[PDB]
Symmetry: C4
Subunit: 343 residues, 4 copies
């Protein structure tokens, strides 16, 4: 269900992308002039934004900042500095700083610092074991091919390189054991590979799970707060739901729900309003749920539900939905009649 609410999503990211677009030599006149010019203007928009932030201390209702400001500070100062110090050639390198911006929207890095942090004593141990494993292999591979390939196994670092290629799963094809036994040794190498392949894996596995778990405070602590519905529940029931709860702003003109289109979930409205294409034009206010008969029934969208405007929405899975109907019979009853209003 994507039309325009991620309106903000729709227009800032591109500035970050254009950095790559410019990056090319042996380039013609028609595209280079426009693109190079655009970054200076984007830069200026951000520069204007900075004056507001450094200078201004009001955001609306609630907000907090510090290292985050530092990130923004670095982002604007660097491209500027490139412009100033460098009256010369490549300084577009300095522009790259844009990519710093997207990290702000995620639940990852300052937290990653925290999580990477609490297990630095062990995770580091795994990688060190890794450097070590690379070392023993270099010794093994080198002895078999030193005389035959002074050219390729001439040295430990040459052997070390092959370990690098072989260890990860890349295998370039330029260097290989010409002799029969070396191939046999690689057989052992293949076995150490299972473990190795797994290491690449340990790092992201903990990080993604962590990062997702973290969004629970932003997305699933604050978000839970607007829906008054969430309050009947205490700490144990809420966390399972918290892992489950999902966000997304739908806007002006978006077809939230297509009429006729399957709805295997229901939507809750936090902010903004939505419109229902039905018998009695229903505009939905905060504390509203729609497509609920979708679940009672197990069928579609009741109406074309189109976001009246920019609206933040929460959706509920069938497993979770039974919990809400059971927790509050009154709520099951309301979903059905409101659904009657919705359908």
């Amino acid at each position: 269900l994507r039309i325009y609410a991620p309106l903000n999503a729709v227009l800032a990211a591109p500035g970050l992308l254009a950095v790559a677009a410019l990056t090319i030599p042996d380039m013609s006149g028609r595209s280079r002039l426009a693109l190079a010019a655009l970054l200076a203007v984007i830069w200026g928009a951000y520069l204007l934004q900075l004056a507001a932030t450094l200078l201004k201390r009001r955001a609306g209702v609630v907000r907090d900042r510090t290292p985050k400001i530092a990130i923004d500070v670095l982002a604007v100062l660097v491209p500027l500095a490139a412009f100033l110090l460098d009256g010369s050639p490549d300084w577009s390198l300095y522009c790259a700083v844009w990519l710093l911006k997207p990290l702000r929207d995620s639940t990852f890095f300052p937290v990653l610092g925290r999580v990477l942090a609490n297990e630095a004593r062990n995770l580091i141990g795994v990688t060190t074991l890794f450097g070590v494993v690379l070392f023993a292999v270099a010794l093994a591979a080198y002895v078999i091919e030193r005389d035959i390939q002074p050219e390729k196994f001439g040295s430990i670092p040459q052997a070390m390189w092959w370990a690098v290629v072989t260890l990860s799963t890349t295998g370039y094809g330029d260097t290989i054991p010409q002799s029969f036994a070396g191939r046999v040794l690689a057989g052992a190498v293949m076995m150490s590979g299972i473990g190795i392949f797994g290491l690449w894996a340990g790092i992201l596995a903990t990080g993604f799970y962590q990062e997702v778990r973290r969004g629970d405070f932003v997305r699933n602590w604050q978000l839970v707060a607007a829906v008054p519905l969430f309050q009947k529940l205490g700490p144990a029931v809420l966390v399972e739901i918290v892992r489950a709860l999902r966000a997304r702003t739908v806007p002006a003109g978006a077809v939230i729900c297509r009429i006729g289109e399957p709805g295997d979930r229901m939507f809750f409205v936090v902010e903004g309003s939505v419109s229902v294409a039905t018998p009695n034009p229903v505009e939905l206010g905060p504390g509203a749920f729609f497509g609920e008969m979708a679940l009672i029934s197990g069928e579609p969208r009741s109406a074309t539900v189109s976001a009246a405007t920019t609206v933040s929405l929460l959706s509920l899975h069938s497993a979770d939905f039974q919990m809400l109907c059971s927790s509050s019979p009154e709520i099951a009853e309301i979903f059905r009649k409101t659904a009657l209003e919705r359908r």
Copy 2:
């Protein structure tokens, strides 16, 4: 066990596969004439089916449709259009549309939109981070080999390409740092690799997990309606069972359970009938469980239980089976006497 169980599974899939067989130049023979003709006939079968769906509004007693119809509409209209608009040599491209059909029987894509959707703000950030990482690497690799390989590192996009090959774990072997330091840098590239290799991973891991979760809850609900047995239980106990419950439809002639053959689980019958090769011919009706003494005992299939006909079966794990025997001692008692009937 498989014989003619998903009778339906056995037949439709082949039409989807034939698209690949046809797709060959420098072709001759008996093979090309038959195959090209078959797609038009398959198209016609589906075309006939479409008239039925567009025209017909009765399905028995269990269905709902909309975007799904749209998929079917696209599927038939496209190969049709190629036939009409194109009197031209290549229109078999348009036929490919068949592969759209398999998505229909999965728990994934409409659902995928919901998963990918609720975490689009975090998930895309990781990939954007990926473009970023790729960029810095292009810079580092390019500086090392620009003079040496105007031919290979002639430009950022050339460097960028190497980052693509190297980042994933593919490594073609046509480009590499000739110089020693470059090889050393690749050592750093290798450590960034763990993170990288992991990204490829974050995407399917979440999708498969959800996809299975989506199908399972519905399957459990269906089993509960179908198996009266499921009703004693409330929302908390059923979900664990729901992840566990599993289904297929055995048919005519399938030997559901080989006699003598180990049975480490038992089967429940939702629809259809089954036949038991035992002292008293036993045909099993709905609400029937068999091979239960298999579990009480911990041994095989009681009988050659062959599907009397097309039958939908559910199987229960030993861990789960204890829960059913303990929840209802009456049920445990029944499993043993019926088992006496079954064995």
Copy 3:
């Protein structure tokens, strides 16, 4: 710890491995005569074993069999047949059958069948999605390089091959887009790669998790069944322990616990006996636990605990151990005083 513990593990496996050692042409004298001869003798030993099983209805202590016998039947008949039917030089191919044997001691394949089976309706869909994804890529890649490489992209299957190389993470290096855009297209391909990389993964993730889950049936009877200790507990407490419980059979002469050697767990004895190197020689009978002061204290092995003989041991985690001590104060008291006996 290992000495001759799985006395059985030590000897049968080698016969399975020897199949590979023989497999070499341009072979000479001393190795070939012995190795070829050995398989016939191993075959004969198995043939004798078969006569016993086909003709024998007695057991060491409780068993069940049917499809398993069929596996054994196929295993001996094939190398036999090769011997008889083939006076021909290559029939060692038929010998390979040995590898069928190891599947017998695992918790996987009959189970894999049932599990793969209950989700063939969806796992197959993912792979099908894979064949189709492969198809769109072949079309895309072919278009860019048809004129340039009639030799490499001369045909869809030629393009299809590259999709195979690229899709998995192998990348041979013999084929690549010569032109700039193809490399750009490969950029999209790289992104579709993450999804693909994940598919390879979806299959094992379900199988390994489950295969381990399955051994619970063997494990519960094995540790829970012979340790009277396990009976205080009911179905909910046991399963968590069940995932946790672990086993091996130590033998004659094995030093179960090195004396002075850290013991981060304790061992339970199901079958066989063990000896303790301490003030009072202690031989441990069934229903015995040792190295428990290792946990109360959090320090090593009390004594060199050496398996008096072939013994089946279960070990308990510190997390689990607290549950045992808390569930039964009397048990906590016994562990310390017995420990006094052990230390």
Copy 4:
């Protein structure tokens, strides 16, 4: 946050790394003289420490050792032996032993032995299955290319090598099916690959998870013990917290909490002291928590909290924090007043 926190971490690791730096041929005098000499001195420092451990029976107040000592013994004796036995040019190989040390601070290897150990019966079966799969492929690949590439597929081991390259996801590029059908067979090979790719995976997945689970006794059993806070809770609540609890030792001069800097957690002090940059200079004693208003509020670090000295800190997640405040309202109340002192 990191400054001189693990003071110890900062110094020992480098000695381990230096082994790689020295290991280079075609080297020059300026770098080589210093580096070669450093290992002898590092060796001597370790030699000194060993005499202390060998001849000493005290330290701090709570330790145990045996196999661990054996590791240390092997570590010093080896480089010594190389020095003594070998007046010879290459003995730096013997020095490598340093890397043995890192395993000491991890929760993995003795324990890995423990887990690998209770699952030798099942992991081994999969790996052997792997050799088996490799065998069938060597047979199939060899038949297609024996005449064409006596040079590449001349033998099963030559075919076997390709199986190694192909099986893992490396693909060098030197040996490929020239013929069309092999390319088709490779299509089957690609499918068996998913299964293959997964094997590499089963090994690290269980190992990392268990390894992390293991630090629960060191880090989350005895270590938690210093927070009196942990006592109210019983065995079930603690384990969830135990997986969650995390540690580092900040030192002299580290700014624990940047002031202004987001604090999305709070820190507990086990050992050492910390200083708070606020209205009342606050030095924090053991049993202290800071940045708690960070959670009540959901905003940063109250103060620049800088480690007064070497301090061991525990940090608490928001999900966990709610449990703490709810378990003891008295504690919630204390967090806010202390927070008043901290802020």
